[PDB]
Amino acid sequence: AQVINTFDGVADYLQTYHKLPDNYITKSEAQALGWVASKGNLADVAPGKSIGGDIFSNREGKLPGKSGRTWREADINYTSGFRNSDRILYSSDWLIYKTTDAYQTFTKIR
Amino acid sequence: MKKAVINGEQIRSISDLHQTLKKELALPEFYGENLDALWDCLTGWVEYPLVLEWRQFEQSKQLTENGAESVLQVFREAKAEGCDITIILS
Structure with missing residues (x-):
């Protein structure tokens, strides 16, 4: 498929298919x-590939935490x-x- | 092989610690200077193998609050993750 690596494209894809674009x-795989x-x-x-999918540990605790909630991150706007x-x-x-x-500041987009 | 030195007695704030790391690990120009950016640099930027020599750890702990310890923990988890990092604490 064509590369999807923009905030909106990836966000839409994540919520619609519950996985990252291809x-x-x-x-590790990289x-x-x-x-x-x-x-x-x-x-x-790894032509046309971007780093994404690894566990994000929210080390500074700026994203909201919850019993059962883990986070993941992916690179955006990378070529x-x-x-x-x-x-x-x-x-999750x-x-x-x-x-x-x-990672200094974060914006809720969905 | 990359070698990074921290002279603990010269660390007067957590800001000094991230700025000392930026220089010694040749971090990005807009290095985020937080734990999240540190992890992302150790596992997606920095060159290996790496030897981090942290001198005067206790002294550097006095003016970073929990900082020093937090930053060392990140290096330790990066080494648990598979990074070729050698940590020297003096």
Whole structure:
């Protein structure tokens, strides 16, 4: 399928199909195919793919917590080279947030 | 191989700690300076293998509140995750 890697496209997809679009791969899988983060070679070893799907630990506790709730994150607006500061955060009960400032602040988008 | 040094006695705030990490780990220009950005950099940016040498840990704990400990925990979880990180505490 065509790459879906925008906040709205990914958010719609997450809530509609309850999974990430096909162009997302976790850090481990990316590493299993050759990704070396400081080389910024993800597009080389995994064309059209973005890092996403890993557990997000909400270390600073800015996203809302709840008994039974875990979070996951995915890279947004990524194509190739070194990673950026844009992420989409989606929970097990399908709450969607984003950040555009490397996890300093968050906005509820769903 | 990357080596990062923290001179604990020179840390006067949590801000100093993230700024010392930005420089020593060659973090992004807009490094978020939070625990969430730290994790994301250790598992999706930083070069490995990595040796983090944290000198004067106790002193650096006095003016970061829980910070120092929180940041060390992130490095430790990154090493639990599979990152090739060697932590030296003195």
